[PDB]
Every structure is written in C-alpha cells, then in structure tokens.
Design a protein around this ligand. Structure first.
Ligand SMILES: N[C@@H](Cc1ccc(O)cc1)C(=O)O
Length: 199
C-alpha cells in the first residue's frame, strides 16, 4: 500500500516563474518492473487543476527515460548530471527543458493555449516519486513498484523565481514517499540543495 507517493520539497506561494535544478542519475534495482522518477515542476499540490513538470525515470533493470508533461523521449545513463527546468510565462503558457549536461544533449518543449488544464503558479517543487501506470481507458491506475536507488538523488543549484525574484527553499514543506507505513525516502533540504536518499 502506497500511502504517500511524493518525496521532496514543495514551496507554496504565487506567480511562480521558473523552477530548475540539476540532478544526478542514480543506479536502480528491484527488477524490470520497479521504478522511480525525479522531476521539477510547478503546481500539482494545492493547485490541482494543472501541473507543468519535467524529469526522468529509472527502472530496476538498468534502463532510463526522460519526459515532460502539462510525452516521453536525450539518452540517460547512470551517473549523468541532468539539468531540469520549467517556466510558466502565464497560467496557460510556458516551457519545459531537460539537458543531460554529461552528454551535451538538450530537449525543450513550448506550451501555449493549454485547455487540458490551467496553472495557478502557486506551487514549486523538486520531487522523487513512485509514479503510476494507467491503462484500460483510465479505469485502472497502479503505482509502479518502487525501485531502490543509489547514490542519493540530489537536486543541486535549485532555483525558484516568483515575479522575477528569487525564492529560497528555506520555508519549503518536506514530504517522503511512504509505503506499507514506512518511509522509503529521506529527502532533506539545505541551501539550494534538495537531497533524497532511498531507504
Ligand atoms: N499521486 C496522487 C496526487 C498527489 C499530489 C500531491 C501529493 O503530495 C501527493 C499525491 C494521485 O495520484 O492523485
């Protein structure tokens, strides 16, 4: 039973502009079906109408993948350093960028006139998640088995902007992934770093 599927730091506020950080790609285990994801994003917490996010997933069979969302895809390998960023120019327009830094590859997507859902620009976050896999229309969504990973996934040089001004993580709320009533992550903040160890 997955009781909490998000681990990491969440800032609450208004007019959030850009959210970005660099994260290392960990080694993962637990089987081909086990997985995990690290991403940066805007909204999705108190603002449940939309979510602008981008990041990458790791699977227990040693494979990886990158994605953005308001579509998958860059080649990702254990140890790579990935710079992730999202920008909300408005409640209905923005962009998502993912750059491997280690391989020199970079991908980006611009969004506009999004009708699927609008942003409030009130939540900024750096998250490690036990994501869901859905199918059969949408009548069946299940959390993927949570993969073990190492070393710790660290979001470094975290940056959050509001109305053009910087916002420290000083007052960010902290959450942990919790499965079968046990913390499976130990995410903590310090300076401009959000560090999440697997437990
Ligand atoms: N994962 C939840 C959404 C969620 C949003 C924010 C959280 O802090 C935790 C969970 C769902 O599938 O509906």
């Amino acid at each position: 039973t997955v009781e909490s599927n998000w681990g990491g730091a969440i800032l609450i506020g208004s007019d959030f502009d850009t959210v970005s950080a660099t994260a290392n790609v960990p080694s993962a285990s637990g089987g081909s079906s086990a997985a995990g994801t690290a991403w940066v994003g805007i909204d999705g917490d108190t603002c449940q109408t939309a979510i602008l996010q981008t990041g990458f997933d790791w699977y227990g069979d040693g494979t990886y993948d990158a994605w953005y969302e308001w579509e998958v895809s860059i080649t990702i390998s254990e140890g790579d350093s990935i710079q992730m960023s999202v920008t909300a120019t408005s409640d209905t327009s923005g962009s998502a960028t993912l750059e491997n830094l280690t391989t020199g590859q970079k991908v980006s997507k611009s969004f506009s006139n999004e009708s699927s859902g609008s942003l409030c620009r009130t939540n900024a976050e750096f998250i490690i998640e036990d994501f869901e896999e859905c199918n059969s229309n949408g009548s069946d969504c299940e959390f993927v088995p949570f993969a073990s990973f190492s070393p710790a996934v660290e979001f470094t040089d975290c940056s959050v902007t509001s109305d053009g001004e910087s916002v420290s993580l000083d007052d960010a709320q902290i959450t942990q992934v919790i499965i079968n009533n046990q913390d499976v992550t130990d995410c903590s903040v310090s300076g401009t770093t959000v560090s999440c160890s697997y437990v």
